Amino acid sequence: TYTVGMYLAERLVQIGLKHHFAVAGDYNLVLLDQLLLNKDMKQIYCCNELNCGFSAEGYARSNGAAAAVVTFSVGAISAMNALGGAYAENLPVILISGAPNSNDQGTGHILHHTIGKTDYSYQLEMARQVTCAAESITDAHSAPAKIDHVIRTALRERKPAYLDIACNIASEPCVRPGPVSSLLSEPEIDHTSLKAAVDATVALLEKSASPVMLLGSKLRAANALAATETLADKLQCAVTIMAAAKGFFPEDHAGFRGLYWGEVSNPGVQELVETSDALLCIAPVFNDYSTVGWSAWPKGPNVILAEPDRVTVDGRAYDGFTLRAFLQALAEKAPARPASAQKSSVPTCSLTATSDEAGLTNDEIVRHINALLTSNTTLVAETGDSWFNAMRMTLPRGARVELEMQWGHIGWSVPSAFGNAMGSQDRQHVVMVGDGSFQLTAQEVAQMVRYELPVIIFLINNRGYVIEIAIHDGPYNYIKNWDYAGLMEVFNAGEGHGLGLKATTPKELTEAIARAKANTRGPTLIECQIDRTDCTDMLVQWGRKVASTNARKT
Amino acid sequence: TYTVGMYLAERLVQIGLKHHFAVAGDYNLVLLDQLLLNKDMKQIYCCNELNCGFSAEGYARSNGAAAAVVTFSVGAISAMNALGGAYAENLPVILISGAPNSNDQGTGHILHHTIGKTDYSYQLEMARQVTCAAESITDAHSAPAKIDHVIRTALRERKPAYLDIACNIASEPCVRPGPVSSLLSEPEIDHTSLKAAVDATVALLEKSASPVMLLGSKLRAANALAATETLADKLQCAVTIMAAAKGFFPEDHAGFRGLYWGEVSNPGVQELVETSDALLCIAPVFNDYSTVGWSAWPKGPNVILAEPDRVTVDGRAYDGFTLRAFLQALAEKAPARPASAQKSSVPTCSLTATSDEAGLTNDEIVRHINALLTSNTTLVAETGDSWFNAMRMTLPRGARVELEMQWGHIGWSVPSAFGNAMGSQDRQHVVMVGDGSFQLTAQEVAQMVRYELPVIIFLINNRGYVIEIAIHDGPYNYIKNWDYAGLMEVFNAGEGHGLGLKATTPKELTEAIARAKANTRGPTLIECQIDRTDCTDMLVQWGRKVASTNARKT
Amino acid sequence: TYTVGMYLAERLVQIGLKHHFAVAGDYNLVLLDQLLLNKDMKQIYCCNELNCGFSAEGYARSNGAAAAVVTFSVGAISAMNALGGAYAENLPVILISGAPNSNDQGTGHILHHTIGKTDYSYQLEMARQVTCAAESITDAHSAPAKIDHVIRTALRERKPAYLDIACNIASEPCVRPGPVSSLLSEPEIDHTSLKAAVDATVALLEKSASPVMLLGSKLRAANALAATETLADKLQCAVTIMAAAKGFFPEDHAGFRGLYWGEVSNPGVQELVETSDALLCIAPVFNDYSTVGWSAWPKGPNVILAEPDRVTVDGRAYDGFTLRAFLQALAEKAPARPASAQKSSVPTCSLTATSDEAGLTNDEIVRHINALLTSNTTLVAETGDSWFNAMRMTLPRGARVELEMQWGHIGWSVPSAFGNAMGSQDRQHVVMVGDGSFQLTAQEVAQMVRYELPVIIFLINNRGYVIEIAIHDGPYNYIKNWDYAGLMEVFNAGEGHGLGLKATTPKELTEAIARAKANTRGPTLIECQIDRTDCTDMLVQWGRKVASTNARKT
Ligand SMILES: Cc1ncc(C[n+]2csc(CCOP(=O)(O)OP(=O)(O)O)c2C)c(N)n1
Ligand SMILES: Cc1ncc(C[n+]2csc(CCOP(=O)(O)OP(=O)(O)O)c2C)c(N)n1
Ligand SMILES: Cc1ncc(C[n+]2csc(CCOP(=O)(O)OP(=O)(O)O)c2C)c(N)n1
Ligand SMILES: [Mg+2]
Ligand SMILES: [Mg+2]
Ligand SMILES: [Mg+2]
């Protein structure tokens, strides 16, 4: 006897999901039962719904998509924070909420977990604001069409979507889903437009002296990584990254020239791109953070703006094809233009070295983490100064970096890494998280313990919101210190294999990392103590400009 | 010097539009100027915005898509009625509104044509409710992406979309649009799913004794007319239509068996479909009107439900392909199953004949209009008793019928026929419209005069809302009578070539139609006077069941 | 046996309504039946829902509030245009929509008059955008609370509100409404705040040399007319009006000094207010039209901004009392400050006179209408050049002017006058309407005929959108001319007592007005033919500034 909930489960499996995340509530228990009957995936549990959503977000990063299941209102609303995050970071997370019994609809009944009015369509209205698709299932017959619609839309658009299922309907008989090639289907490509866009770009490139490539944070969502480095091989030119695109290109590569981020770029790089004859700008996200208060925002006649969906070049916009198809086709026809690469040096990064027994230093933490990175590593870098020393690392080919520079929700780090680890258990997972950020979502380290995930967490204890102290200080930047290392035993409670360690000197950190690598059955939190004054120059420079731009009066 | 408004114009032309409809207002004048610079289409004008929207709707029916341009709030809101209509009737109308100067945004300025508050995002929020896409253009740089998004989404989904352009931005420099194959692009078809759906349907058909085809009102939007009659040729079986699908299948055809509409079906037809071994139900819209108060709604194991997007057959749903591709593929493999056709008669319709000089009769009007219909005719039938004698006509192969049975906005008839005529000037356009409906939108007959469109309008003057009088009578059903024939000279005003005639007897109607056919440079309104008591039995039967179902207490 | 619909009816009667306006549809028929059972009011019918809404709006102007009843979506959406209008013009219109059977809710049924999806909460979401309160009645038990909430909120806020009643629920048993003092209840007045505001204003006035009063278009909604002229009697100072406040002060008065409207003010008046020591600015609406493109917008330390709700004077805002209470209290304590009045002349208006047999002239039309005005007259002036010669009339004490300068929906004129006449049948009703505007809503003159309302309509036929031709001309300004006078017989159809006359010379107009005054049982339309070139200088001046401001690039 095949139910609506089973239909949902089988479709999620067809997406390529092996896990979904959940927090139980009476509105979703039966739905959770239906999902559990599918042995092709595991149902894993979170502390709260905010973390649950961000766990799904992290999973989407490594798997391609994700699903989280919550209860009505009290669960769903906080998960909408994570949904908005998924939208901001171009990740197809599917949020499924339990919903009131369909027989309660239009009766004037007031229900628990509602704001106390006779109707309760407010949740769906809120969800629409942060999703590409949002449906409320209230009968078994229309359920398949709705489920299929949200999933297919989410995957095609690389955006999150929302689902309601009335609690009494999860159990209802339902037709079975058919076999599929894939649940992802892009629109059929417009060949007239593709040809014209490639021709126009080739023409501009041919008459150029020194083209540069600038890579943006939508490159992965556009599924355009391989196509990009193929194009880079053909062009021979300099390849640069925007901050949020770290790890989207192999730094091993002959053409890699480093970070473009306005005045905090690697030396020479600002001049490289700002002055380019033909800037091949691929999948960028230009906002107030990435353009450094609108001071570093390349546009106009010399820019080839190549977005996931469309290409703008030489005063014309060409639409109706995928970025991936454009980059593949362009690589066939593009000329060799090496001038940019041969006129510039491979990026290097100066890190000040200390002695063994000196107090631990920001630069010294970066030096130690850099040495940890392998081709099999995923580095998660939290909002705060961790953004900036993420930029300062030389990452080996194959290594992955995860940033959340568009949403920028502090605390994202922890549950995100948890989900990400679930979705790629074969990789080494490393987290950089500030003390302030950790406090928002700390409890999710307990899930890492529960599920025996060997994540290495570098907790940067500098005693407050330093990214804010350096830029605009006030009493609001100072938080209650915790014994972060001591928190691991609390989550262990005599069961788990989590480790909590203090690093107070470079010697003490070197020992802590050795212990961490040996801890195969649980997370390792290393509380790194550095002085509040000891942040990157990069942060100070970037912050001053951004803050004065956000405070602008005219 | 190429502007945002010119970009919009060139994209509309690429859709295949040769006309757009407009009402001027200060928020859209510059935009209208930009559109006028494109000689590939004509800008035509309407009396009011409700009519403007319905004109676009009518144009979409004959052309494939349409566009209407209105001013902020005072224009846009009433056009949203038509937009909802377009959504209901699966037509990609694009509504473009003029909007306040972008420099007024966030200033706290109160603007004219707004509700008087400091912000005015209320319009876009309302538009989202009735569209598949809705964007507000407030800068030139993001304008192309937004324009392209609404147009492409509208065409793919066969749903209307909405656009804002800030009045100061219509003039702004803009990149040019690239060449395209087509602005329509469906998602790439899932071949695993298609194969399994066709295989499952063929298996069910093979073991069937008498399959029937039932055609619904989404058949045209799914662009599935030719594929349907190809399938009908292969299957040899009985082909029946739902009310709203009149004209979607040639009544000339050997397999045509008439109307399925519950208890108001053609004799034998209800038994034919209700009792079928395997009901091939194609692109249906099952609502309270079409299912006749939920009494005639075929579903369950014996039904092959083939929707624009998906197919449900034998307890499985198959998604990820177009209806058209499904129907083409099914026609290759389907067996011959003629039992349904050879066990039933070609539908006939009994019409009572009167004498020349007797007072005009409902049946006699149908008889006269039926004789007018050619393969080159488009018949527009208004909500009211005109729905019912539209059903009662035998239409020659090629003839088109236009119904609005999902939205059902009285008055739609007139502006809709106007737009439809604009979009197919080579065809003969015939309108059936009640006296009550005509009063809502009458003024648009003046546009037909202005643009010299030879539409023949049969105004059925029965002195009120008869469809309502017959079912649930009250003082609200009785309206002020007009001299409808005399109204033509009013719109002529010594310029135009409109004709207004009274038909009071069958002889008098026969003469009026002769005059109408001869009137090549303007519309002809024939005020047909029939008694209030003289409506179809079909209406009474249908009405009683529907009304008692809508008044149901449990 | 007492029903939900009867409850609604009795509450409407308690508002002081004697009429409600309706268009029948199956979703509201039973509701209409319930309302008809209340003999304390009359149910009157409209051609379409846009006109229906604007009829209610007009009724609210003379009665204080109004109600319109429409059917779901197809009716309600276009009525939302009128609702937005009511919000803009501060009038408590209650729109009541019929809605689907409550048993259809949450079933996945598709219903007629919907966009075709399984749910249909889109209407309520749209209504919220343009109302102060919006409720959907879906059970009998919560119906009283909801009805009482929308009505009370509407009246308190002077804003429109929205109601849904499920069609099956109009008939349901319901408790009866209790007796009331009034359905209007403002919040209890804050006496600390009132005292401080009056004290601060008196202090500023006392040390002033020449205070001026400037009256705005919210004066009537604030129910502050009598209080204003009491204050003017005490202050002895100059009293000036904003355009939209015409008729809110007796021009008979010793202190009346005319129109303040930037550069189109009466001579000297701009200097009077712009230069005032202490500008008592009462219930103003400052928008781009009233401030003449932001060039005439008095603010800062010298301005006493007295709004319906709050007073800002000398760098402090005082809230928590009604404008009426503030003005009453201020009149007790205010000093005499006559300087502004004795330094300026009573406003006069130069009108050029022609001969009897010369072609009719704009100035000559104004001269004739001015002579018609009595203390018992209500003048309705449409958007267009009619705004401007409304300003140019000297109105006798007691005379009423109706303007719609915030919404500015052309066509408003006609249905608004109809409703207004219904709500004050004892008064003489005069309409000024342009030819372009008349075309949008013309059919509602048929209702005036039906209900035997002796409205005198001056149709200004200047052959297009002249207000637009003078400012920014293009093909979109030119419309199909009608025989406007001939349209009356069409609506009469041998029944009614409407008159249609042409005025082509001043003699011919003088005769037409004589006929109009004698026509006691129907409307009289006088088609006044003037040249397209013959608009007010006032319009040209005002238009040029406003248009260049709306087209501003920075
Ligand atoms: C949910 C949320 N609240 C507030 C902020 C604003 N915010 C941005 S950074 C930041 C400080 C983070 O401090 P920490 O984790 O200690 O990193 P550090 O600056 O010390 O390196 C805050 C509070 C945010 N990004 N997200
Ligand atoms: C905008 C709108 N308002 C009201 C209705 C409700 N309605 C449906 S049929 C109908 C009667 C129209 O009668 P008429 O055009 O004279 O046709 P008849 O059946 O009398 O021949 C009405 C008022 C509607 N469908 N749409
Ligand atoms: C519903 C609506 N549609 C469009 C407009 C834009 N508009 C403002 S004035 C105007 C012209 C009015 O023409 P008419 O009534 O003849 O005035 P006149 O010739 O005296 O200038 C138009 C179309 C509007 N204000 N409201
Ligand atoms: Mg910190
Ligand atoms: Mg009728
Ligand atoms: Mg005019």
UniProtKB/TrEMBL annotation, chains A, B, C:
Q: Which residues form the Thiamine pyrophosphate enzyme N-terminal TPP-binding domain?
A: 3-109
Q: Which reaction does it catalyse?
A: a 2-oxocarboxylate + H(+) = an aldehyde + CO2
> Could you mention a single GO BP entry for this protein?
aromatic amino acid family catabolic process to alcohol via Ehrlich pathway
Q: What cofactor does this one take?
A: Mg(2+); thiamine diphosphate
Q: Give GO cellular component annotations, separated by semicolons.
A: cytosol
Q: Which Gene3D superfamilies match?
A: 3.40.50.970, TPP-binding domain
State one Pfam family annotation.
TPP_enzyme_C
Q: Where does the sequence pass through the membrane?
A: none
Question: What class does this enzyme belong to in the EC scheme?
Answer: lyase
Relay the cofactor remark from the entry: Binds 1 Mg(2+) per subunit.
Which GO terms of the molecular function aspect are on file? magnesium ion binding; pyruvate decarboxylase activity; thiamine pyrophosphate binding
* Keywords assigned: Decarboxylase, Lyase, Magnesium, Metal-binding, Pyruvate, Thiamine pyrophosphate
Q: What is its EC number?
A: 4.1.1.1
Residue ranges occupied by any Thiamine pyrophosphate enzyme central domain in the UniProt entry: 199-316
Ligand binding (Mg(2+))? D435, N462, G464
Q: Which residues bind thiamine diphosphate?
A: D385, G408, I410, G436, S437, N462, V466, I467
Which part of the chain is the Thiamine pyrophosphate enzyme TPP-binding domain?
404-528
Spell out the family assignment given in the record's similarity comment. Belongs to the TPP enzyme family.
PANTHER family recorded: PYRUVATE DECARBOXYLASE, PYRUVATE DECARBOXYLASE C186.09-RELATED
Tell me the protein's name.
pyruvate decarboxylase
Q: In which organism is this protein found?
A: Acetobacter pasteurianus (Acetobacter turbidans)
